[PDB]
Nucleic acid binder design. Structure first.
Lengths: 100, 178, 91, 117, 70
RNA sequence: AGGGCUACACACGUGCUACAAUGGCGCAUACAAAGAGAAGCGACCUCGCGAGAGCAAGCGGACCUCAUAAAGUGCGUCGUAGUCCGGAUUGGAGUCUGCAACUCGACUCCAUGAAGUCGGAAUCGCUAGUAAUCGUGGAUCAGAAUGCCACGGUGAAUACGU
């Protein structure tokens, strides 16, 4: 299903680092918590609106194989259903069918 | 009555001269302030009548004359001779003293209302101020079981016409609504 | 209630409409694809048409509108007759 | 007098008493009585007059329904009149600060649609 | 002059003047043809930042990472 | 891009919190396990009613830290009164995470403060570290758990009989 929704995510991750990174972190000091009566620079939002594309609140996860959008596991890059089948076939070391 | 002392001493000559009048009761002179207040009938047990009594009480200490539904015809209905609105034709020199706050700096109360325009007093110089919110005397409490909105204030005038009306109500001071 | 950004809040996209308008005064109202915003004095007295999700509804800005969010002053959903009972519509 | 001079309750130990006096709950009730130098561990009854007469004044700082609860109301009444999606929802009398509705309005509205009518 | 109703009418002497001679009137805009905002000043302080946090005496130039403090 | 996913009148399935005096209220006081943490978790410091704030060690994890278990105990306290429970709602101020908290967030806080006084008919889970209850920790997670998953305290009634 919809290869495009997964694709839509990728460009935001390449731009998250490439455009945004040096302008990102700018908020807390010069915009947000640490700029009180240090200018306050009352033009920050307008700058960062194309970075709305990029900013980590505006991009998530998805599985790196099949791209399921829910129930990711950061440890792996996959999600609930598809991960377990890779475990079933032994393709992660050390990952036994658990018993305690 | 200091508003009316202001009018005797300062305004009567201002107005006389500027309008070119020839005799002192030819000149403008502000008359008989009156009120109404219309209640949503008296209610089945005459409780909105009590609400007429305390609101009158707010800006006249008297009792109401209390006007009656003379004819009763359409949708408010029945009785055709039972109490309705709350009229006071106020006392004289004292009523003019009341006029010292009674439509002057009645303003911290005001939130707008349909009257007080230097264009829509009638073509006879007679006008009705429906105030909504009570003037404030300074004594204890502000739980009056309030009837939130009240009091059409019908100022009457030595005035027959448009020119005597805006002699009053505008630049006699207090100003009309801006 | 819930509270606001701890830094500016101004929103600048609707400022981006407003900044050429603001000293031009009265004309066709600003169609907003930006309801996110606060409202403050700089925006007083213009008619700012508030996206409901599909069409702009004019809000004329005055003193009360120093308060709060823009959208806060204005509908999106048509909450209907009480209990989902009516046979007319107001599109 | 013993009682707060504005309004009337009676009895019980002083600490619980100011939300009985009214308009001040427990945080203000400890601190306000303590600033005046008036105890929590006393009956309302026994009070030496220097604590009470000072209590009648030390209260006068804070809430009385006659203008205040009406004023805090008139702020909402304005909101109900103002023309806001926030106030409009206060006009229709559904939950409006926090909640949404599957079935969740009994706190705000009292009953479900009731009776035989 | 019927001497038996009307209990008060005048007793402060009608003091009101500006803000300052008992109760208020203020400015030449004393015609009060609108409602109450209940929401403007001091939060809107004459300025458009709605409560940035507690006062620092540093307030540096640019950017940060909060959980590293370096 | 903005709305919507989240509406609300109403009915239904599940979990929550309580209706108290074994108790609730204050202080003092005791002993957990298991975990997670580099662009993260983050002490001590100094401010702040509180959330938090800011400064910064440290951590690379049986080292530092998240992180102080809590109920229980000990003494005072309330005295069955919808209260001193419960605290939903609701006003205002406040913190915060973040392009952005208004539709539609989380959290502090102050004030106020409802229903609930053991719940028809019907109906579910349960035999032992189980049931009941107290709290802990994490995955999803920018933020946002009442739920999920696991962790440990205190720790029971009883099954005669088919």
């Amino acid at each position: 299903a919809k290869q495009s929704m997964k694709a839509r995510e990728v460009k935001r991750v390449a731009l998250a680092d490439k455009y945004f990174a040096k302008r990102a972190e700018l908020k807390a000091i010069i915009s947000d918590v640490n700029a009180s009566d240090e200018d306050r620079w009352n033009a920050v939002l307008k700058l960062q609106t194309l970075p709305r594309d990029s900013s980590p609140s505006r991009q998530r996860n998805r599985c790196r194989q099949t791209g399921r959008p829910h129930g990711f596991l950061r440890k792996f890059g996959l999600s609930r259903i598809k991960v377990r089948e890779a475990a079933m076939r032994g393709e992660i070391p050390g990952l036994k069918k658990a018993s305690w | 009555a200091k508003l009316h002392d202001y009018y005797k001493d300062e305004v009567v000559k201002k107005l006389m001269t500027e309008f070119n009048y020839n005799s002192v009761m030819q000149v403008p002179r502000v008359e008989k302030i009156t009120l109404n207040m219309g209640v949503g009938e008296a209610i089945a047990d005459k409780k909105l009548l009590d609400n007429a009594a305390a609101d009158l009480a707010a800006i006249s200490g008297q009792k109401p004359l209390i006007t009656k539904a003379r004819k009763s015809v359409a949708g408010f209905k029945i009785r055709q001779g039972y109490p309705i609105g709350c009229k006071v034709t106020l006392r004289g020199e004292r009523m003019w003293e009341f006029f010292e706050r009674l439509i002057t700096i009645a303003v911290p109360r005001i939130r707008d209302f349909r009257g007080l325009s230097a264009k829509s007093f009638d073509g006879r110089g007679n006008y009705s101020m429906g105030v909504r919110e009570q003037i404030i005397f300074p004594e204890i409490d502000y739980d009056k079981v309030d009837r939130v909105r009240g009091l059409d204030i019908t100022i009457t005038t030595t005035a027959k016409s448009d020119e005597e009306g805006r002699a009053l109500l505008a630049a006699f001071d207090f100003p009309f609504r801006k | 209630p819930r509270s606001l950004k701890k830094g500016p809040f101004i929103d600048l996209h609707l400022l981006k409409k407003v900044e050429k308008a603001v000293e031009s005064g009265d004309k066709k109202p600003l169609r907003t694809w930006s309801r996110r915003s606060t409202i403050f004095p700089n925006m007083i007295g213009l008619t700012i048409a508030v996206h409901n999700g599909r069409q702009h509804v004019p809000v004329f800005v005055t003193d009360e509108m120093v308060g709060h969010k823009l959208g806060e002053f204005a509908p999106t959903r048509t909450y209907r007759g009480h209990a989902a009972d009516k046979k007319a519509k107001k599109k | 007098a013993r009682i707060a001079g504005i309004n009337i309750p009676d009895h019980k130990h002083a600490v619980i008493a100011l939300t009985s006096i009214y308009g001040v709950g427990k945080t203000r009730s400890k601190a306000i009585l303590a600033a005046a130098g008036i105890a929590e561990d006393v009956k309302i009854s026994e009070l030496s007059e220097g604590q009470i007469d000072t209590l009648r004044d030390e209260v006068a700082k804070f809430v009385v329904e006659g203008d205040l609860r009406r004023e805090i109301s008139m702020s909402i009444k304005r909101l109900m009149d103002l023309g806001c999606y926030r106030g409009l929802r206060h006009r229709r009398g559904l939950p409006v600060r926090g909640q949404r509705t599957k079935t969740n309005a009994r706190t705000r509205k009292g009953p479900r649609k009731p009776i035989k009518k | 002059m019927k001497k038996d109703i009307h209990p008060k009418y005048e007793e402060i002497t009608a003091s009101c003047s500006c803000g300052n001679v008992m109760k208020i009137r203020s400015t030449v805009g004393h015609d009060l043809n609108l409602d109450v905002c209940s929401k403007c000043h001091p939060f809107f302080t004459g300025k458009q930042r709605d409560v940035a946090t507690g006062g620092r005496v540093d307030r540096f130039n640019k950017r940060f990472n909060i959980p590293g403090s370096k």
